[PDB]
Amino acid sequence: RRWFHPNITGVEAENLLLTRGVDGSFLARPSKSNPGDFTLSVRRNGAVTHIKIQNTGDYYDLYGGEKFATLAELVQYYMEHIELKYPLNCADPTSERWFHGHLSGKEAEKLLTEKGKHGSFLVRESGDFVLSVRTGDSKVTHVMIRCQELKYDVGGGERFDSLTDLVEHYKKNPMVETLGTVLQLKQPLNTTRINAAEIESRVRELSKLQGFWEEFETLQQQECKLLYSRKEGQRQENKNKNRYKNILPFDHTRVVLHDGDPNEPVSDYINANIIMPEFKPKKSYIATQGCLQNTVNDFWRMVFQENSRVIVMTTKEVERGKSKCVKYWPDEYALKEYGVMRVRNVKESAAHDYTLRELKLSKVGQGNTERTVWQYHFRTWPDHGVPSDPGGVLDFLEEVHHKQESIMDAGPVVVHCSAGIGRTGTFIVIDILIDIIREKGVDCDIDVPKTIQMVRSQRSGMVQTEAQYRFIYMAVQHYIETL
Ligand SMILES: C[C@@H]1OCC2(CCN(c3nc4n[nH]c(-c5ccnc(NC6CC6)c5Cl)c4c(=O)n3C)CC2)[C@@H]1N
Numbered sequence: 001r002r003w004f005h006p007n008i009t010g011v012e013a014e015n016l017l018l019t020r021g022v023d024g025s026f027l028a029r030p031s032k033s034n035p036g037d038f039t040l041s042v043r044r045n046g047a048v049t050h051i052k053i054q055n056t057g058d059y060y061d062l063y064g065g066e067k068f069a070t071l072a073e074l075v076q077y078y079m080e081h082i083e084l085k086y087p088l089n090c091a092d093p094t095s096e097r098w099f100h101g102h103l104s105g106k107e108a109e110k111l112l113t114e115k116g117k118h119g120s121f122l123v124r125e126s127g128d129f130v131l132s133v134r135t136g137d138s139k140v141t142h143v144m145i146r147c148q149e150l151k152y153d154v155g156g157g158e159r160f161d162s163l164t165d166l167v168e169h170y171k172k173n174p175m176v177e178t179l180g181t182v183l184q185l186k187q188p189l190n191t192t193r194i195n196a197a198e199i200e201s202r203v204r205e206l207s208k209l210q211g212f213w214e215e216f217e218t219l220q221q222q223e224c225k226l227l228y229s230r231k232e233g234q235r236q237e238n239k240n241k242n243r244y245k246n247i248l249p250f251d252h253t254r255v256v257l258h259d260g261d262p263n264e265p266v267s268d269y270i271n272a273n274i275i276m277p278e279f280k281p282k283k284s285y286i287a288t289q290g291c292l293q294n295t296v297n298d299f300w301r302m303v304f305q306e307n308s309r310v311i312v313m314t315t316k317e318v319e320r321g322k323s324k325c326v327k328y329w330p331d332e333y334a335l336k337e338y339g340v341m342r343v344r345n346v347k348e349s350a351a352h353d354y355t356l357r358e359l360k361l362s363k364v365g366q367g368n369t370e371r372t373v374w375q376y377h378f379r380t381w382p383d384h385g386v387p388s389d390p391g392g393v394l395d396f397l398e399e400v401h402h403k404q405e406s407i408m409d410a411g412p413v414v415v416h417c418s419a420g421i422g423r424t425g426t427f428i429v430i431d432i433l434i435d436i437i438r439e440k441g442v443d444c445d446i447d448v449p450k451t452i453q454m455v456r457s458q459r460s461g462m463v464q465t466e467a468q469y470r471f472i473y474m475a476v477q478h479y480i481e482t483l
Contacts, residue, residue, distance in 0.1 A: 119186020
């Protein structure tokens with residue numbers, strides 16, 4: 001993911017591609033004119049083309065292109081299918097997990113002493129730099145990094161173009177001390193894990209000139225490790241089963257549909273993934289896209305087979321004149337058959353922020369297969385961005401949690417929006433985090449980007465924007481404050 005430059009301007013991007021690039025050279029950057037948006041800058045026939053990428057929280061929408069779950073997936077697609085030939089690599093270490101910009105020597109040592117373990121390392125500014133590594137069962141070693149004529153070195157040997165290149169080299173080739181100590185750079189220092197009681201202090205330091213952005217962009221740089229196979233969703237027979245062509249379930253976590261019509265060559269596919277905390281069917285989730293008219297039967301087959309008793313719908317059926325999800329439930333008191341599944345809508349209960357629908361699901365032909373499915377439909381989420389206060393979402397997640405908990409042997413909770421990655425990802429992450437505080441008390445350890453990285457290894461692009469990332473912190477804070 002080196003083609004992503006987090007701090008360059010449109011002008012710097014232009015001069016970078018014209019002087020250091022060639023025809024086919026490209027890079028991507030956060031937009032300066034529109035904060036929260038992105039630009040893909042491509043060099044074609046001696047000139048630079050700037051392509052807008054918009055993300056309001058549901059997906060990356062390339063102007064004159066397609067819709068994608070991540071920026072790395074967008075790039076992989078155009079590099080394997082305006083030509084994107086050569087990534088123009090970024091040397092700026094700001095989004096590295098190990099880089100701590102302006103951190104003092106005293107602060108670095110206490111961080112490695114209180115939070116470190118064998119192989120824990122960080123890099124701080126001294127225009128020189130310091131590499132600090134902890135070794136043992138223990139001691140901290142400091143390695144000076146000289147910057148001489150735009151190149152970096154540890155006072156001998158190779159001279160690197162960037163700090164990333166130097167760190168990568170000494171990770172594969174560890175430095176050995178005179179008396180035999182191997183300075184192993186096993187993992188970056190974990191500085192994101194906080195005690196749940198200390199959330200207000202972290203939210204305060206992240207809100208200062210913001211820190212939320214640096215933490216979120218360091219998380220985004222790591223998405224290139226999550227380019228897992230999505231082959232089943234690419235099969236010809238499964239193409240019209242996807243709301244967005246390029247937003248596909250990972251094959252290793254996808255919901256596999258069994259007992260399908262024997263006359264149907266392919267009846268095992270749904271654009272849905274199992275999401276397991278720390279990767280029990282109960283405390284599990286199914287993140288899925290909003291139903292298409294041709295996937296409504298597959299959706300009820302999925303709900304039935306998984307023994308799900310609770311559905312969370314986080315979108316209105318229609319938003320900004322566009323279909324986000326088709327009505328997959330009957331009108332109040334009506335009974336509908338969706339293929340071999342039968343659904344009765346028993347009652348509809350309206351609250352301020354959401355609607356609750358009591359649905360009775362069963363298989364046609366078998367009376368004793370009947371179970372109540374509780375559908376919680378959040379209706380107040382803004383068309384763009386996140387709510388200004390997390391109170392509404394928290395009361396909703398509390399209700400959903402109590403329903404799931406009261407049901408013996410309940411299957412995973414089904415969570416869906418439009419693409420089933422943005423709002424869906426945000427609801428699932430908040431709910432994982434809150435469940436840790438429920439089970440272990442306010443005196444517990446939480447790590448927001450670790451939790452998101454784990455959920456993202458099970459479905460592409462879970463939690464889409466920095467606004468959602470910030471919302472997760474604000475929701476966890478509010479839960480703890482009212483505790
Ligand atoms: C300029 C800024 O200075 C400080 C700075 C660096 C330190 N830091 C931070 N941010 C993270 N965002 N995402 C992750 C992340 C990504 C992938 N996997 C995991 N965990 C899984 C168990 C492996 C995590 Cl935790 C982060 C991480 O590890 N760290 C330490 C805060 C921001 C910025 N360079």
